């Protein structure tokens, strides 16, 4: 995945 | 407020170099990858390179058109993203933004650069809704199927060149979007639904999809709301 940090 | 505030563009060379410059704040900087992004007349909206985060040793990821000859980087005590341009090309000319965050909420204004598996992401040119209807973007790739694994964003940009991001991860709001907004899947593309379109709404709307270590845009679609 990318980033996918919220 | 976060900003993104760029600087080092200019009016160069072909075969010459340019260091571009972004300065964030607002938000945890040393939390989120970091990308570049350009904007020409000839092929649209262009992701160029990301970078990731100190635990994962500042890892890069580079766009076919400038591995070799870019360089991004970033200092997280100054909460600054850096690109390095060699060897530059007629073709490099367009408009330079850092942007990121879930995962393209967050614009810089740009900065001009004027030098004087080969993906398809497919949107509508352009649609024409009214104040208070329902209007629906897709965004279709070549390669089959938009899935979940493609985390689909959506952003839009306004009169002179200024991006917003709306929807990333396929279906989450980016902070403080309005709520007319959504994403979706929909038969095998990925959508963005206003849901009682405003006259503000009037834009370009861009998406862009993930294929395992890189971003491909649309051609974006050009939204009137007439009435
Ligand atoms: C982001 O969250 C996704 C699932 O929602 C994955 O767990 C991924 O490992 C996370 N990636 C980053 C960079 O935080």
């Given amino acids: 995945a990318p980033d996918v940090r919220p | ?227």
């Avoid at chain 2, 870019?70 to 330079?96: C, H, P, W």
């Fill in chain 2, 1 to 227: 407020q976060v900003q993104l505030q760029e600087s080092g563009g200019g009016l160069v060379q072909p075969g010459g170099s340019m260091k571009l410059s972004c300065v964030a704040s607002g938000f945890t900087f040393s939390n989120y990858w970091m990308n570049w992004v350009r904007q020409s007349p000839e092929k649209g909206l262009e992701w160029v390179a990301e970078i990731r985060l100190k635990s994962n040793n500042y890892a890069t990821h580079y766009a076919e058109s400038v591995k070799g000859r870019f360089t991004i980087s970033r200092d997280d005590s100054k909460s600054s993203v850096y690109l390095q341009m060699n060897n530059l090309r007629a073709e490099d000319t367009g408009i330079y933004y850092c942007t990121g965050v879930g995962q393209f909420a967050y614009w810089g204004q740009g900065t001009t650069v004027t030098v004087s598996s080969d993906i398809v992401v497919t949107q509508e040119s352009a649609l024409t809704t009214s104040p208070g209807e329902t209007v629906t973007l897709t965004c279709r790739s070549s390669t089959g199927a938009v899935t979940t694994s493609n985390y689909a964003n959506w952003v839009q940009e306004k009169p002179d060149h200024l991006f917003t991001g709306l929807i990333g991860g396929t279906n989450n709001r980016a902070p403080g979007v309005p709520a007319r907004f959504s994403g979706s899947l929909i038969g095998d593309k990925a959508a963005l639904t206003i849901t009682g379109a405003q006259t503000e709404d009037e834009a370009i709307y861009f998406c862009a999809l993930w294929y395992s270590n890189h971003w491909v845009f649309g051609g974006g679609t050009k939204l009137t709301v007439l009435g």
